[PDB]
Paper text:
We reconstituted the biosynthesis of the benzoxazole moiety found in nataxazole by adding two enzymes ([name], NatAM), to 3‐HAA, ATP, and Mg2+. We have determined the structures of both [name] (homologue of BomJ) and NatAM (homologue of BomN) from the antitumor nataxazole pathway.
We determined the 1.9 Å‐resolution crystal structure of [name] in the presence of ATP. [name] consists of two subunits in one asymmetric unit that PISA46 indicates form a homodimer. The individual monomers of [name] are structurally equivalent and can be superimposed with a root mean square deviation (rmsd) of 0.348 Å over 420 Cα atoms. Residual electron density in both monomers was best modelled as AMP not ATP. [name] has an N‐terminal domain (1–320), a C‐terminal domain (326–404), and a C‐terminal extension (405–436). A tetrahedrally coordinated zinc (Cys248, Cys308, Cys310, His254) is found in the N‐terminal domain over 20 Å away from AMP. In [name], the adenine ring is sandwiched between the main chain peptide bonds of Ala212 to Pro214 on one side and Tyr236 on the other. The C‐terminal extension (405–436) is a novel feature of [name] and has an extended strand followed by a turn and a shorter strand that reaches across to the other monomer filling a pocket in other monomer's C‐terminal domain below the AMP binding site.
Author numbering:
A (entry chain B): 0 to 322, 327 to 436
B (entry chain A): 5 to 436
């Protein structure tokens, strides 16, 4: 406890103390950055930044820089010192590489593990995010290991672990915590109902759901909580190349982990960087060796506030607005989402999609037949009142956007076989997935 | 825990094993399964009493789902797993941190070594099964850079694994032997020669299916003559045998008592032909007493040229069961040796066969100029070596393994709800 190497909540009593925790790490950080081919080349000829003061002059690092430096242009240590290598989600054609030492991994795990509900050895923790190149599954599992929780590696987007099998695991293993994106929370609820289980009653050991990766309105988050019996839905904000940079407090806001990174809001028009306001999320992580980043622009649209929260945490808050005009009206996924998830929970509307045409908003959603026409009418009124856009809203039969087989299919985990008996299906010979 | 070199004879090995049995028998009796099994009676407590210990069947692990085999409080578990095979009847297994050190050490017994300078591509599943987690933990134990490929995942198609193999200078892979050929076919589709264009690739680790020496040597040749290092394991046991430099798998008998079960007689011997029985010696969470993995195996105590003081094991599994086809008996093992005895220039890697009562139906891919020579030579080989009537069909590449499997690229999408007029909104809630 005495010789803990990185700060934790409670180590500062003021914003000036926080700023000194940050400033004191900058000489080590600037020295480590200069070991990478990217920064050594950037500061070739000139004198590199070495002091906290020099940081004010440090040029933004763009997503496009990380892509151009693929794979190891940002690497500051020998490859012998790397523990894991990762690529970000998004375009497969233009990969974003990131990589971490064991010591880098302790910082990552500690940041994920800042869940206000706690992670305890008595928890059974279902990790239902991908383990394929992306960090998300590995990050949750490492936080689970750090805190002693029993980790169930569900993975996501894998033929080994369909939703039917995840519902069975949730129920029969008395799972206490989940990690999955907010769409997966509704997919698991629909799979539960398909198996004849009520998400709001039949999972009494489930005490919290951890989520990230999508823009999530308070309206949808509250509905996800309600679907699963009113348990906490605990949001964090991160990326493969940064780790977790903000986490929810008990009052439902995400706070920036400023003890572990310098956070700045970038106005691309102005080219200026401030500590707060509206603009693009810029990050300087303070406790990484392998892949130093100096003012990395995640290029997410964010609002950062230094206004105190009811939680009492001495950290700024962040709303993530995401990274369409129909006549004058701007329509965001966020605004439509608040209207869709304001429908009464009894209508069981979870799955929807919209297309922004120049002239009209096309919107489709699944609802059971009895409530479909009520739902279409109420959502139409809500769009008229709140957005005033012309719309074509179509109610769909369940199983049309999210097929019954996604919710109920069971899939044997087969190995390759080459010789078959007459009565066997040899179409699973070499293609056994 | 012992390492190779800690015993100088089979009697010393047996004493390393016997000395752990009191702790193991005591830990087993903490589980509801063994407590119930030995209810009323006095339980086995000594090395000598082990000779009387009843086999534990696969069906027992299934019946005890989920935590009937659990010997510690759930607070002490690190990870929970389910085995490959039938989804309808899950086999649960689970491990403490200390259980995980034994698992990682056993996997890390690769005669080629795992070193911090290695870049290690883990191309097996992380979904409930242990295999991806096991390789990653061994990688971490030894300081190798782990690239988590995963397998059976939409995030990591073959095209992307081939790109990573090449551009990251990958030195080691972990994937089943069919995935070794799938990566070779995907390599060619990306314009890369498996036998020349991956000069940093120094070894390929493999397991999970019956593998003849003939096929293993061909996999090595496809990838430029580098070592193909086989292990034998299961989700519920971990790695129980690993390859030596002479190309045989040795049982990790310092970490588990191995016995061959004859199902008709119900007897257990140290060696011979029968079903693989395992008593792991260094696990707390899920003690197993003579667990019958029910794989068909031959164990030999004949000394190996490698000088390792451990018995060797061939694993037949399902690949050893004879199908009767007219006069002859055919195993997958024997067919495999004939298919992979075709000249390497024919590029025959993907095949399948059906045992009919009257005839062996066999299909395989071979590129166009050589396809008919391949069909003729494989026909002659079957006549000379098996004498089965056969119908052999040579297929164009892309028939058994479609070109799309080898070349498809898939963006890793999040859910999107709002789309622009010109976008495909059939990626909305089904974004996988
Ligand atoms: N809580 C969140 N709210 C909104 N967007 C998020 C959130 N968490 C992550 N994201 C988005 O997901 C990106 C990270 O993608 P990846 O590198 O694949 O994890 C971020 O840069 C954001 O665009
Ligand atoms: N080297 C190997 N040779 C043959 N079969 C193997 C080998 N390794 C694993 N297996 C098979 O895979 C099973 C374990 O499956 P899983 O629990 O999914 O790892 C074993 O019981 C065998 O049937
Ligand atoms: Mg390394
Ligand atoms: Mg990203
Ligand atoms: Mg635990
Ligand atoms: Mg198994
Ligand atoms: Zn707060
Ligand atoms: Zn040997």
């Amino acid at each position: 406890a005495m010789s803990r190497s990185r700060p934790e909540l409670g180590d500062w009593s003021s914003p000036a103390e926080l700023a000194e925790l940050q400033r004191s790490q900058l000489p080590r950080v600037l020295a480590q950055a200069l070991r990478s081919p990217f920064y050594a080349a950037r500061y070739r000829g000139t004198t590199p930044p070495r002091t906290a003061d020099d940081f004010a002059g440090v040029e933004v690092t763009a997503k496009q820089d990380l892509r151009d430096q693929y794979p190891f242009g940002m690497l500051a240590v020998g490859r012998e010192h790397l523990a894991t290598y990762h690529e970000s989600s998004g375009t497969a054609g233009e990969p974003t590489a990131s990589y971490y030492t064991e010591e880098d991994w302790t910082d990552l795990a500690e940041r994920f593990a800042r869940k206000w509900t706690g992670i305890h050895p008595s928890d059974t923790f279902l990790v239902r995010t991908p383990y394929g190149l992306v960090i998300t599954g590995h990050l949750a599992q490492a936080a689970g290991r750090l805190r002693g929780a029993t980790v169930v590696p569900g993975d996501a987007r894998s033929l080994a672990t369909p939703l039917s099998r995840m519902v069975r695991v949730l129920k029969t293993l008395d799972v206490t915590l989940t990690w999955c994106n907010p769409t997966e929370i509704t997919m698991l609820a629909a799979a539960a109902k398909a198996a004849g289980l009520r998400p709001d009653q039949d999972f009494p050991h489930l005490r919290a759901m951890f989520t990230a990766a999508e823009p999530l309105t308070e309206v949808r988050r509250r509905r996800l909580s309600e679907i699963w019996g009113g348990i906490p839905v605990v949001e964090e904000y991160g990326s493969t190349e940064t780790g977790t940079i903000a986490g929810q407090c008990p009052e439902g806001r995400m706070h920036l982990w400023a003890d572990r990174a310098i956070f700045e809001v970038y106005d691309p028009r102005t080219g200026t960087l401030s500590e707060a306001g509206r603009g693009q999320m810029v990050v300087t992580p303070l406790y990484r060796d392998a892949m130093p980043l100096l003012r990395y622009n995640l290029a997410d649209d964010v609002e950062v506030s230094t206004d105190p929260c009811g939680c009492g945490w001495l950290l700024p808050t962040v709303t993530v607005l995401g990274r369409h005009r129909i006549g004058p009206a701007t329509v965001t996924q966020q605004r439509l989402e608040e209207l869709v998830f304001s429908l009464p929970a009894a209508y069981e509307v979870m799955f929807w999609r919209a297309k922004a045409h120049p002239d009209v908003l096309e919107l489709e959603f699944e609802a059971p037949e009895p409530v479909r026409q009520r739902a279409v009418k109420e959502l139409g009124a809500a769009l008229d009142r709140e957005l005033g856009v012309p719309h074509r809203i179509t109610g769909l039969a369940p199983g049309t956007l999210v097929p019954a087989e996604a919710l109920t299919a069971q899939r044997d985990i087969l190995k390759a076989r080459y010789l078959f008996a007459e009565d066997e299906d040899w179409d699973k010979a070499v293609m056994y997935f």
